[PDB]
Ligand binder design. Structure first.
Ligand SMILES: COc1cc2ccc(=O)oc2cc1O
Ligand SMILES: [Ca+2]
Ligand SMILES: [Ca+2]
Lengths: 409, 426
């Protein structure tokens, strides 16, 4: 059973093509991001279709179709009256739609509500990553949630204005910290690498294992690292090691940061497009599998150095210059995404906050083996997508961690 | 920069006091639309604070378990009710930092829920640990749950338990719909009718005034004494610092805002009505126990009338403080909750913090060396101002003003003339 939800009240009089920002049109984001929310305890089917319909008054672009435009290969978003977001009513893979490129450009936002008699239900979503980032999506979902809870109007009104706020410079200019991560190769597909079948697996990590880990890196290097730095170091090393990567292959650690607060001037509060740029560390595989973790952890710590206004403006301008030319960060890229402490909590439709949340996409940040830190004696889940050949050695690495045999050099 | 979040503890009551669910109704003061906001403040100080606050919290939650609960709109009337259930928790964000006061950094010290998101988690604490046995306690409480004094009952109860107390010394009183209920034949007097108005389409906190900046001003006990002595010389009346300086700030801010000459502007503050009701509210009552008082004038009059007149207007506003004023305000809410009760545009809220009991919130590390409010939405104002407590010539307090970005240059100039004692009294 699949309901085609249109806006409650119709906002568009005549058609409307919006362009997307230079961050939106990054080739790494030509993918459908797939995730699901679980909840316990009018039915959730009905409650989310009503939220959806009223939020679509303000978020009507999600209803729209992406296409390529003949002048360049950039996406623009066609919006027209009659457009609708599909709501599917209803192993884990069947819980959120898996649209192919065409279906994903045709329906860049697709929701699914699976109820089963065991109280709970699941909300699945398949949003094309060019439309928006995780903060953007979460503006959209908190807006639906708040409307479900009886809100009078949406509390933050969404801002488009994308080609204006995140456009290129009239005289484009790209700095060394962008040029040194990236390369041009029209013939390279970050997501088409022959690495065998990619598995998904989950590992619990205890707040106490991490504190052990930081205390020892501190004793041996006099720096305190963040969980992200220390644990990311450890997972990166373990991954590259298990993939038996050739010693002189350049490997990379990539993560996404929110730049909204950091621009001059800051981005609007209502801004729901892509408002993240990828940050990197790179090193030879051999150096990584054999240097101490404190060095690798330090290398990641130093990468947020490049978090600045100019770094973002460089990245955009690089895309102006080379969109048609195959921009990529090459092979050996591992993506990492921190999810531990977003506000999952407030996407409350009536049934409380989601008891667990789960990303299914394994193509992200120009990686095929992206890793995610998922929300909460105490500890959190680490999800790793890793090629099948590497996964047994990797399980053993996480089991050594679990037992605090960290192998620090 | 580099503030981590080490973890988020979901603290439950020590012992769980509900068997199954429980909806509590809130008072018609609690459900005032101007209170549908989060109040955000932090306390600065110099087993760990993290562990000691979580254990206090857990044992207070035996008596204060509604802080754990979720605000929803009722199926009958669209007022907030508070759903309480076993499982429910107060979030404690534990976080750490080193390294270089900075405006939008201080924002990270306490969570920043939107009004609607704040209903899901109406009570959020944050313990940010710092170098050399120093830390910050941040709090984001939905204003419908409780007021200043109410929170302060809750925090002193945590603190006394931290100091080794056998039990909490005052049992909190709910009983809200009964003690602050409306009259069987609601009746609303002209002192309330004249401040408030009805517009379902009006958002006190959604007006288009631009970005709102926050800035702090030191004001010397000596500048104020010059200020009172001169108002006295020129009118023979004695004004409090709240009257004289409030006058001055209000005029300077309306003037800086270039406000149209026949706009009605207002000066609003909140007063504790606990001791004033008949009968009084019980001591353990921790909901909202305050009503706003106002003074109003056309903007043109305020920017050009002498200060002593404006200070007089504010001194005369506490006239309206009575039992009946409260019962009028409540009954106006009974009548017109559904119809958009508001005090309109041009309201500047003021809050005096100089003589409350900050210092008994003592967890182990003494009382807080300084305290700081972050919310800029309060009293139906988008530009609230706060007088902050004390730690001859150098002695004084900080005045914190939330003012739209376009007006803040002219306002700085105004406080600089004050600092130098160029008061321009007419
Ligand atoms: C207890 O948390 C609060 C603290 C204060 C303090 C001053 C004020 O203006 O209002 C408050 C509302 C609150 O919910
Ligand atoms: Ca390069
Ligand atoms: Ca009126």
């Amino acid at each position: 059973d699949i309901a085609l939800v249109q806006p409650s009240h119709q906002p568009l009089s005549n058609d409307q093509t919006l362009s997307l920002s230079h961050l939106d049109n990054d080739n790494n984001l030509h993918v459908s991001f797939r995730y699901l929310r679980v909840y316990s305890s009018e039915s959730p089917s009905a409650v989310v279709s009503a939220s959806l319909a009223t939020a679509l008054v303000h978020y009507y672009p999600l209803a729209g179709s992406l296409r390529r435009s003949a002048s360049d290969n950039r996406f623009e978003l066609l919006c027209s009256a009659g457009q609708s977001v599909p709501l599917v009513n209803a192993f884990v893979e069947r819980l959120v739609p898996d649209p192919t490129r065409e279906e994903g450009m045709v329906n860049p936002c697709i929701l699914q509500v699976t109820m089963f008699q065991c109280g709970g239900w699941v909300l699945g979503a398949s949003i094309h990553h060019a439309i928006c980032d995780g903060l953007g999506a979460s503006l959209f979902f908190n807006a639906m949630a708040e409307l479900a809870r009886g809100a009078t109007k949406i509390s933050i009104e969404p801002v488009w204005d994308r080609e204006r706020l995140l456009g290129p410079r009239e005289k484009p200019w790209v700095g060394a910290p962008v040029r040194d991560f990236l390369s041009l190769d029209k013939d390279f597909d970050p997501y088409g690498q022959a690495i065998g079948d990619v598995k998904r697996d989950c590992f619990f990590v205890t707040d106490d294992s991490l504190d052990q880990l930081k205390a020892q890196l501190l004793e041996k290097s006099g720096l305190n690292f963040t969980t992200f730095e220390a644990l990311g170091a450890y997972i990166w090393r373990a991954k590259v090691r298990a993939a038996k990567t050739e010693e002189k292959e350049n490997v990379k650690f990539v993560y996404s940061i929110n730049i909204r607060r950091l621009m001059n001037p800051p981005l609007p509060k209502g801004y729901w497009g892509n408002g993240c740029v990828p940050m990197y560390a790179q090193i030879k595989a051999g150096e990584l599998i054999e240097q101490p973790i404190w060095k690798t952890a330090e290398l990641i710590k130093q990468s947020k150095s490049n978090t600045s206004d100019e770094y973002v403006r460089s990245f955009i301008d690089f895309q102006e210059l080379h969109h048609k030319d195959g921009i990529n960060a090459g092979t050996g890229v591992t993506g990492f995404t921190d999810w531990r402490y977003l506000g999952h909590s407030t996407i409350d439709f009536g049934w409380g906050g989601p008891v667990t949340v789960l990303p299914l996409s394994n193509k992200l940040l120009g990686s095929m083996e992206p890793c995610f830190f998922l929300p909460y004696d105490s500890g959190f889940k680490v999800l790793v997508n890793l090629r099948e050949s590497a996964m047994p050695e990797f399980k053993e690495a996480m089991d050594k961690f679990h037992k605090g045999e960290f192998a620090l050099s």
